[PDB]
Amino acid sequence: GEIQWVKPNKETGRLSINGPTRTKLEPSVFHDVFEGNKEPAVLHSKDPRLEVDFEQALFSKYVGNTLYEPDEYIKEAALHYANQLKQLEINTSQMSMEEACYGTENLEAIDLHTSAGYPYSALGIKKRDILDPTTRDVSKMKFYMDKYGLDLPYSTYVKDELRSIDKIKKGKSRLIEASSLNDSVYLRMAFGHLYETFHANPGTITGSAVGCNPDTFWSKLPILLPGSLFAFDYSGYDASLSPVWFRALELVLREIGYSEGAISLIEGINHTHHVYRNKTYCVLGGMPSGCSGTSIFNSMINNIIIRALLIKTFKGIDLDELNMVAYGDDVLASYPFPIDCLELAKTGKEYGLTMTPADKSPCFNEVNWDNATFLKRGFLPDEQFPFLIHPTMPMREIHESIRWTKDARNTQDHVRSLCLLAWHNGKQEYEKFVSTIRSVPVGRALAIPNYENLRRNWLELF
Ligand code: NI
């Protein structure tokens, strides 16, 4: 991805948003009971902790575009993923606005608590004003869709979340790039059925884990990805995507039967205008973070990329032997033989992709079921029933996170949530976690859930 220009909002005529004021994250009543080294991300320019220039840290994610136009390696990839999709019989037809907004059994309703984007947030119009689940009215949406039309700027602001000290010093906060309600509705209308099938089918046909529930999906993963695993990390995947990938996405949507109208939506994703604060700017390449189908399209795109890398890098590689699931940038794969990911990573840099070994690793080593990471989590066979895999959220992460809160009344649920994650790590870990919690009179007053109750519940899902 690459910014093409920047200009003042007076010139472009775009409305401006309020800068978020303070972080909403406070010290929790466990702030110093547990250890970690994370604080609220830098949320503005004058943050006393900044060792560098903010705005140029913000936008350095956009490392250029290396290629605008699919070569043969990419076209063949796209087509193989497209042919693979064929068997899911994706409904290529437009979804009703009602469903688009209000959801069906496999597409969640538009989230009423998120911002409505441009120009809604600048005018103080909230989704709640336009959308009511109790009536499923779409007449108001039609009205605003007429009023402001389509293909609007992405309203961009800083994500209020926890970051390492390293990222706070180095100004590496993350951006939220929210598409306008108008464009979310329209994208969902054009691709809602695709979203539905993808939610209903996490696995190796879609090649997508979006919407999976790791509680159960983890047990399928060994079966779905047999033979020899592989996995790595990308640095700033989203922003490093050059247009070529949007082009390749188009080939895939064409080949599975989409109309040209629906396909033209993609250019409005590959080429976006954003409004960060007082300026508006043009990005060409890069998946916006907050675009309706971000997750899926990123996941689809990654399906294209892994295949392209494979067949550009190795000869006689048979793509039907591949298995992968992708959740945005995050991929878990297998193949019947080992795969030299160092060479993949090199091929990757040619395309503008930065690939590093799995889990901050020193080296492109072995990934097996024991060290493998997916959606932050590791894989641990249940001791009694080894066919059941537990998703292991590192405790390090659970510790970091319990030390802060955005709502001071939520301690109870905040701890319970963390417990629902921590127990997958084993009885002895869990006890260690709960005992630290219970190490402080406030801990002791909480209803903390029982290890063997959590486990009996977990079994009852299989
Ligand atoms: Ni532009």
Question: Radius of gyration over alpha carbons of the chain, in Å?
Answer: 23
Beta pairing, strands 389-392 & 404-405: unpaired
**Contacts for 41-49 with beta carbons within 8 Å, 24 or more apart?**
41/158, 41/159, 41/160, 41/161, 41/162, 41/163, 41/167, 41/168, 41/173, 41/174, 42/158, 42/163, 42/168, 42/171, 42/173, 43/158, 43/160, 43/173, 44/19, 44/20, 44/158, 49/168, 49/169
Find the angle CA(238)-CA(145)-CA(137) to the nearest 5 degrees.
105
Domain finish residue from 311, 343, 368 = 368
Sequence letter at residue 332? L
Task: For residue 39, tell me if it sits in a domain.
Answer: no
My answer on whether 110 and 191 are in the same domain is yes
Q: 421 among the known binding-site residues?
A: no
My answer on whether 326 and 356 are in the same domain is yes
Six-digit token string for 380: 């641990």
Task: For residue 414, tell me if it sits in a domain.
Answer: yes
* Most distant CA atoms of the chain, gap in Å: 66
Task: For residue 23, tell me if it sits in a domain.
Answer: no
C-alpha distance across the termini of the chain, in Å:
43
- Cα of 188 to ligand 1 centre, how many Å? 23
| CATH number of the domain that residue 388 is part of | 1.20.960.20
Q: Which three-class secondary structure state does DSSP give residue 56?
A: helix
| CATH number of the domain that residue 349 is part of | 3.30.70.270
My answer on whether 277 and 141 are in the same domain is yes
Six-digit token string for 393: 């959220």
The answer to whether 364 and 233 are in contact (CB under 8 A) is no
434/217 Cα distance (integer angstroms): 26
Task: For residue 122, tell me if it sits in a domain.
Answer: yes
409/402 Cα distance (integer angstroms): 14
My answer on whether 312 and 421 are in the same domain is no
My answer on whether 135 and 2 are in the same domain is yes
- Cα of 95 to ligand 1 centre, how many Å? 29
The answer to whether 28 and 403 are in contact (CB under 8 A) is yes
Six-digit token string for 40: 């609220």
How many CA atoms does the CB half-sphere of 137 hold within 13 Å? 13
271/246 Cα distance (integer angstroms): 10
Give me the numbers of helices (H) and strands (E) for the chain, helices first please: 21, 16
Six-digit token string for 1: 């991805």
The answer to whether 262 and 85 are in contact (CB under 8 A) is no
| CA-closest candidate to residue 398, choices 377, 422, 380 | 422
My answer on whether 222 and 351 are in the same domain is yes
186/110 Cα distance (integer angstroms): 12
34/403 Cα distance (integer angstroms): 7
319/143 Cα distance (integer angstroms): 48
Q: 140 among the known binding-site residues?
A: no
- Cα of 273 to ligand 1 centre, how many Å? 6
Burial of 157 (0-12, 13-18, 19+ CB in 10 A): buried
Phi-psi region of 203 (alpha: psi -120 to 50; beta: other; left: phi over 0): left
Q: 409 among the known binding-site residues?
A: no
**Cβ neighbours of residue 236 under 8 Å, at least 6 residues apart?**
61, 63, 354
Strand partners, 177: 156
What are the distances in angstroms from CA 304 to CA 93, 258, 283, 299, 309? 23, 17, 22, 9, 9
Please tell me the total count of domains within the chain.
Answer: 3
Q: 163 among the known binding-site residues?
A: yes
What resolution in angstrom units was achieved for this structure?
2.6
Task: For residue 103, tell me if it sits in a domain.
Answer: yes
- Cα of 243 to ligand 1 centre, how many Å? 13
Task: For residue 257, tell me if it sits in a domain.
Answer: yes
My answer on whether 253 and 312 are in the same domain is no
The answer to whether 237 and 329 are in contact (CB under 8 A) is yes
Q: Which residues are found with C-beta within 5 Å of the ion, ligand 1?
A: 282
DSSP assignments along 415-431, one per residue: HHHHHHHHGGG-HHHHH
Q: 167 among the known binding-site residues?
A: yes
- Cα of 281 to ligand 1 centre, how many Å? 7
Strand partners, 209: none
Beta pairing, strands 271-276 & 154-158: parallel
- Cα of 278 to ligand 1 centre, how many Å? 17
Q: Is the peptide bond before 119 cis (omega within 30 degrees of 0)?
A: yes
My answer on whether 387 and 275 are in the same domain is no
Alpha-carbon dihedral of residues 428, 432, 437, 439, nearest 10 degrees?
130
- Cα of 153 to ligand 1 centre, how many Å? 10
Residues composing the chain: 462
My answer on whether 331 and 399 are in the same domain is no
Q: How many CB atoms lie within 10 A of CB 342?
A: 12
Six-digit token string for 80: 């193989």
Six-digit token string for 129: 């004003």
Task: For residue 421, tell me if it sits in a domain.
Answer: yes
220/317 Cα distance (integer angstroms): 25
The answer to whether 243 and 65 are in contact (CB under 8 A) is yes
Q: Which helix (H) or strand (E) covers residue 144, if one does?
A: helix 139-148
The answer to whether 398 and 33 are in contact (CB under 8 A) is no
| CA-closest candidate to residue 378, choices 386, 388, 369, 365 | 369
My answer on whether 354 and 453 are in the same domain is no
Q: Where are the alpha helices (DSSP H) in 284-440?
A: 294-313, 341-350, 395-402, 411-422, 427-437
Domain finish residue from 285, 315, 338 = 285
My answer on whether 265 and 195 are in the same domain is yes
Experimental method: X-ray
Residue with tokens 């059941």: 388
293/195 Cα distance (integer angstroms): 8
- Cα of 268 to ligand 1 centre, how many Å? 10
My answer on whether 233 and 196 are in the same domain is no
**What is the span of the domain harbouring residue 345?**
213-242+293-368
What are the distances in angstroms from CA 74 to CA 54, 77, 198, 247, 280? 36, 5, 22, 10, 32
Find the angle CA(92)-CA(98)-CA(104) to the nearest 5 degrees.
70
Task: For residue 59, tell me if it sits in a domain.
Answer: no
